């Protein structure tokens, strides 16, 4: 008790080492030594004015329990960091770029002056880089000094240095055993004369030279760089000696960690071929393909040299499996809708077979829905995908009964680029439609000429259509992406023999750009566009109209609550009942238009209370969303007082905070935002919550 | 239906014209290995025969093979040498 | 929580709770008295009971830790064959998902790193102690493991046939021959070898492997 | 039961036997590594769920060499036999058919061991003849046929259990 800043188990190990193992005679003689040893233990952390006391409690059977009372009074604090000897840079400009601090802003609490012996060497390396990168080649440390005040609260640090001089590079004399690659390597080592010498530039140069050599298979070469400094002209030449090793061959590549996904699945996405000359970049391409696949928490590589030969090397991929798609089964019983039924699954990588299978359905008093979908992504070896689905629904409450079937074939072209094409059938039927200007005018455009006096309306259609699509993604992780782009377009076109005739094109894009080197703060830009239009004469059916708001399009509004609002007709047979109105009234409901455009820019920032160790399961963003939707099959001169619903001007806006967590039940998403802009009836649910 | 992209396929030991030029009977296994590197396959049935095959299958435009075979004696001394610049027929 | 009681009754309740079948409080009291008295004569029997308890509850990583500890403290305990057998058994049973066996998909091409280690452990047991109580079961399980590894190897070779990297399939079937020239998988995979040799027109060995296949056709 | 058997999986018993690959004339087979090599041993082992996966009972002079229960250095070794008689009259409340005291040879009757685990009552008779081996007055138990469920089963594992019941109790009190 009393060990605020340390852990009990390490103290237990310390007493274990000192022959004070639990289950031994309590040596009252050694108590002072035990206390003093623990004082020396806190000597390491930095608590020097600490006192430890021992309490001995006898127990039955003549036993003893020990209370170790710890008093960690005050630890060391850095008073000031004092670099001495410099006539180019001010001290503050140098201290600003260390890790240890001597002072922190009064309005901010993000760190302390807790001196650590390890951080000194890193800080000296940092300072050496800071001078030497701007051509202070001769610069070196004279010495370092760490001093303790005889108070055990103040720590003083001094670094004696020598600014040398300001030198600049002259020319490159790279040579050695280039294995017939002098041209590209000399283009890479090239630099115009007169530019000042830079330190880390040479290191990056060497690393990229090694990488380029590796790309042709020289896995383990030796590259060294040596400067020669002319003091007279303030110049420096550099000698780059390279020695390409033997060309390495992959004996075999293995896989670890995949206890549920069959080895074929992992091996299908490999550009480096077992039994061939090693490609230092193809292995990395395979690794990022595995990441992009989307169901591996972490993937890493290790190229172990086999002891039996100087050439054979085994490439080992180690992966950590993650959950992917999960079961559900809900039977909700009540007074309205009675005992409603619902169940289904939605998972890719079915039992590890690599498929993508999703079945779902619900039984309700007035709404029965079912959908089944399967898709094999690598039907052939090359990677064509064969997929299909069926869906059936009937919704009575509005009456709508329909069922549709579709099949798709996809294939890759070049890298990162895939094309899909397929066929679809859909049978649809509507009955007892409520009065609404847009649906009535669409039906007249079809040629039924229905009666607005009463809602006795029946309509039926059978449609055949063709589907096309194009996808391009280069994004580093298949989930929680942190860098790259992801564009997905898809369109459907009717074909002759179909009651409706139209064409619809939808497009989505997500673009991630990282700022910090460690990929922890990210900038996300999301765009989504959509346009559907009748092919000719006819117009695109209302029941395929777009929407907005909701959770996936624009956070802040309820589901599909953005766009033109419908107009009812008040009359006898509506219930717009005869004893409830007389003149045409707009209806607060929302029916989407035929064109939509939305976007959102947001900042991805880590969350606290989760260690970086488990950071990969939580993700917080600050988001700014913009959205709009409108119709083209609209007239305003026909309705002077009724507001226009064809103006691309009512651009709804929102801003707030959002959070995602890959909980052991699925991707749980929470968000709170405010709609800084709104129009008409845009009832907003401030806080949004959903799964997937 | 050859529109689908296909990753480049390689299966060789990367035989280079200079390296096959260095070949001359009368070396031992270590000497020839240092000349060319460890073969990726040898006959496991009855005899010690070293096969250096150099294949390349780019895109949908055919294949390219440089074949080399070496047979030695039971004392590991080079005895017979063979080489085929292309693949018999197709 | 648990009072400091004489080892007598704590071990007595350990035995009778274990005989009952309740295992949570069983391991709890076992670990308690194991921590409390790491000197008593119980220690050997305590740890031999605790390994069985961890195995039965499927706490396999902790079972492996405890079993390594036991092997370390007395490498020549008179009845170590049992603990080695349990090592192999835990290591093998750790390679099951209990859901892909529901649906009947065979896990013969998943990660075969636990199978290899279980094989090594069983082989060590049968080597050292060929006259103990765990011989025939070890032999049967070890045959099963050998066949599973053969199946995995054939799976990888078959995929490389579908892709068309014939050097790799040649090397894989050759490794099959050197390491498992006794299973059905190699007998089925020899045609892949002959196909491979015929592909690069290195047919001179294709007829050799053809005799290899034909000789044991029946 | 989930008490004295391996995990529920049992599909490995029907394992296809290994057919060694013959070598055609004119060529031979490559070298074997031997890392995965199966030896031949004696049979007569319990397999499947039949095998008793239960930790062995270590006695706690504690002879554990099978039936050998000859516990022996105390100079009062004679009185241990009436001290064992205290275990018989009281404790187990068991009795002996021909319990010699001067010869220190007790023929304890067959007991009835039943401690959970769905264990059928076990009838074990021991030869409680007290020797004087390598020490002062020793005591020995030499078991015989043990009935249990079956007429008599004398598996190697169960013999360790049956001797243990007396080994635990006799060391427990005496």
Residue numbers in the entry:
A (entry chain A): 100 to 496, 504 to 681, 691 to 807
B (entry chain E): 24 to 113
C (entry chain D): 26 to 243
D (entry chain C): 30 to 89, 96 to 107, 109 to 210
Give the published text.
The outer membrane is a formidable barrier that protects Gram-negative bacteria against environmental threats. Its integrity requires the correct folding and insertion of outer membrane proteins (OMPs) by the membrane-embedded β-barrel assembly machinery (BAM). BamA is composed of a 16-stranded β-barrel, which, in E. coli, is preceded N-terminally by five polypeptide transport associated (POTRA) domains that extend into the periplasm. Unfolded OMPs are delivered to BAM by the periplasmic chaperone SurA, but how SurA and BAM work together to ensure successful OMP delivery and folding remains unclear. The results suggest that SurA binds BAM at its soluble POTRA-1 domain, which may trigger conformational changes in both BAM and SurA that enable transfer of the unfolded OMP to the BAM lateral gate for insertion into the outer membrane.
Complexes of BAM disulphide bonded to SurA-EspP cross-linked via BamA β1 (S425C) and residue S1299C in the C-terminal β-signal of EspP were purified from the E. coli OM, and the structures solved by cryoEM. The structures revealed BamA- EspP- hybrid barrels captured as late stage folding intermediates, as expected. Fully-folded EspP β-barrels that contain the native α-helix in the barrel’s lumen were present in all structures. In these structures, both Extended and Compact conformations of SurA are present, as well as a structure in which SurA was not observed, consistent with the chaperone dissociating from POTRA-1 in these late-stage folding complexes. Collectively, these results suggest that these late-stage folding intermediates of EspP are no longer being chaperoned by SurA. Hence, we term these as ‘Release Complexes’, in which SurA has returned to a structural ensemble that includes both Extended and Compact states. These Release Complexes also support the functional relevance of our previous POTRA-1:SurA disulphide bonded structures, since the interaction between POTRA-1 and SurA is again observed without SurA being covalently tethered to BAM at this position.
